[PDB]
Every structure is written in structure tokens, then in C-alpha cells.
Design a protein around this ligand. Sequence first.
Ligand code: HEM
Ligand SMILES: CCOC(=O)c1cc2cc(-c3ccncc3)ccc2[nH]1
Ligand SMILES: [Br-]
Ligand SMILES: [Br-]
Ligand SMILES: [Br-]
Ligand SMILES: [Br-]
Length: 397
Amino acid sequence: TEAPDVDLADGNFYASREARAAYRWMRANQPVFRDRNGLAAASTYQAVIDAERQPELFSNAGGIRPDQPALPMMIDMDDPAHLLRRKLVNAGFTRKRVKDKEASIAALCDTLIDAVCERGECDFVRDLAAPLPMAVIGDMLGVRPEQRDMFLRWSDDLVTFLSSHVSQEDFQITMDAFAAYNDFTRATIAARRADPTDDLVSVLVSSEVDGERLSDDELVMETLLILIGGDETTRHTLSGGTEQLLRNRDQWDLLQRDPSLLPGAIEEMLRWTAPVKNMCRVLTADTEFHGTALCAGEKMMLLFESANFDEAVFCEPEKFDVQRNPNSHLAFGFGTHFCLGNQLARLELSLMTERVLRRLPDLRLVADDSVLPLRPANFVSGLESMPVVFTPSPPLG
Ligand code: HEM
Ligand SMILES: CCOC(=O)c1cc2cc(-c3ccncc3)ccc2[nH]1
Ligand SMILES: [Br-]
Ligand SMILES: [Br-]
Ligand SMILES: [Br-]
Ligand SMILES: [Br-]
């Protein structure tokens, strides 16, 4: 009955395997919780949904990180301006455009598995989970394969900034990474304005809504939002979700014998892993919210992992169950800002997992999860490393 002594802006909290016990106390005793520094956080599924449904009170226009200002990106915007920006960028994310990527994503999955399959061991994080989303989003943005690692480095630097209160040295690194991304992207824009192709910048250049188009400034900001979504999130559901399949081998075995269970497995991997641990909302007025007094101008976190483990919604939430129905998890949020990339992320998860199951059918963890660390970060986090072993096989291509 004593509250957990926690700092919800500290990345070390999210790397602890005790975070879920802290969330459990919040949900049972103070659903809109204030941490040791007074930062407010919605911990229950009900409170998160209710805040998501009230964007005029719980605004994104102060920025979605604690103690960082808004950027001119759709995720830091409110309607009506947000709705126009999202409609413009949606040209890249129509259901048909995303579903048509299936063969190309599958090819990348097979190339990555081909690189390890003869060895009998790999680091699942380094060799499969991190590179696959990077290659997909890189290919959309025109990145040469041998330059993916450079983009991944810029992205890891940007997410480090989003995930902490950086030193001056890490602030400078962040500004350098943006400057390099800006240069590359404005070069792509200029090339595609002169010679359109069918890549993401081409589709976004030509997108038009209510007589409006995206400016070059907006194209840089929106493709940067997409890059980071495309290379810093899905990786952690691939690793951590596969980790749960290997820890609970009855679950691995169900999927291997029935491919039609894969869609529900991907949803359970998303629920469990919740790579995005929080998004902030700024209060536009003083308000009494699920029992807690909130003040105009402060930021409240939405705790999506906590909501995904709320017993009021998910029976036995600490049981990983690929068959779980319903599974209305909040890994992608809810409402006006619901992840634009959700279909792409689900497709990448599906195509890689189906190939892991079939091509590495006896996959096992080298050492159990108790020695596998999570990355300290207050925004997006998952496994650092996941050594796995399997019976070798020959490549496909
Ligand atoms: C498992 C992978 C991913 C997770 C967990 C995730 C999570 C989220 C969350 C939580 C939000 C905010 C929702 C809210 O506050 O209610 C969001 C927004 C967004 N995501 Fe993702 N994301 C993922 C992958 C991606 C990818 C792959 C892309 C693009 C290729 C992407 C693009 C976006 C965009 C553009 C927004 C802003 C939408 C808006 O503000 O209207 N995301 N995502
Ligand atoms: C340091 C400047 O900031 C950015 O470069 C930035 C990128 C970015 C991406 C997300 C995101 C994207 C898609 N899906 C979930 C989250 C959120 C905040 C972000 N900030
Ligand atoms: Br706005
Ligand atoms: Br579809
Ligand atoms: Br594209
Ligand atoms: Br069954």
C-alpha cells in the first residue's frame, strides 16, 4: 500500500522488469498517478482511452515528449490542422499501397534469414529484428543498402534524444543527425519533383487535399516522423514477441501447426511488447480526471504498456496467449493520432514471423530472459540483444 518510488521520465524505469509491478499499484490505487517528481500519468485502460477521446482538453500541440517542445510534425498537431496534414501524408499509407509491399518485404526477410541460416546461431535483435524494418523504410525513402547503417545511426541518436533529457553533447549529436537527414531528404525531394518515381517522396510530393500540398519543409518533417516509426518501433515487437513464443513453447508449437493463428499472434506480440511506452498530452484547462486534479499547461503521460496489462480489460494479462480474443490493445494508441503506420508494422511482423517459424523451426534462446536486458529509454524500448540457436539450413537465394 505504499506507492512505488518511480520517475516516469527516467529511462531506467522502463528497463526494469519491475515496471509492471509499479503499474499494477497505480491501476489499483491511483489510476491517474503522480510520480516522485509530480509528473502525471494515466495508468488504466479507461483513463488512457478517456484522455485520447478528449483531444481538446488533452492536446498534442505541446509536443508528445515530457520537457521537449512541439515540432511542426503531424504528431504534435491538433485538429483541424492535424487532419489536413494526416490526409496529405495518408497518400503513402493507403491500404492498397501498403498491402502491395508484401512481396518486397518478404524478399527482405528471406535475404536476412539467408545471411544467418547456415550458421546455427544469430543475435535475433541485430540480425533480424532491427534490420528488417530499416530495410523496408530505407527502400521507401531511396536509401542505398550500404547506407542503411548510417540512417539507423542517425535514427538511434534521434530516439536517444526523445527518450531522455540529453547532455549538451547529445543535443549537438541530435542536431547534427537532423542536419544530415535534412540534406539527404531535400536532395530526394528535388530529384523526385523533376523525375517522379513511385517511392514515398514521390507519392507525398504529388499528394493534394482541399487544394493544398506539402511544402518542402513539411516533407522533411513528415518523412522524419515516418523514418523513426519505420526503424525504431517494430524491431522491439519482433524481438520481444518472438522471445515470448520461445519462452512459452506451447505457443510456438501452436503457430507452427496452424498458420491461420498468425494474425492473433501478432496482436498478442504487440500487446505484450508495447514498444512506445508513453505519449504526452498537454492540459488545455484545469480538470478533475479520474480522481486526480490536473492543471492547465502540465503534461500527462499515456502509459500504453500499463493499459495493455490492465486486468479490467485483459483477463490474466501476464499470460501470453496468441489466441487472445478480444485483444483491443493500445500499442498503436487510439483516436485522432492512432498510428498511421500500423498496417505496415503488422505486415512486417507477419512476414518475418511466418518465415522465422518455417525456416528456423527449432529456434531456441541461448540464455533465458532473466539475463537479457532492455534498453534504458523513456519513450521507445525493447531488448538490446537476443542470442538464439537453431539447426542450420541452406539459403533460398
Ligand atoms: C510496432 C510499431 C509501431 C508502434 C508501436 C507505433 C506506435 C505509435 C503510437 C503510440 C502513436 C501515437 C498514437 C496515440 O498517441 O494515440 C503513433 C503515431 C504515428 N505513427 Fe506509429 N508506431 C509504430 C510504427 C510506425 C510505422 C512503421 C510508421 C510509418 C512507417 C509509423 C507512423 C506513425 C505516424 C505518422 C504517426 C502519427 C499519426 C498522427 O499523429 O495522426 N508508426 N505510432
Ligand atoms: C528529435 C526530433 O524528433 C523527431 O525526429 C521525432 C521522430 C519521431 C517519431 C515518432 C513516432 C513515429 C511513428 N510511430 C510512433 C512514434 C514519435 C516522435 C518523434 N520525434
Ligand atoms: Br496544431
Ligand atoms: Br489489405
Ligand atoms: Br513508398
Ligand atoms: Br486450440
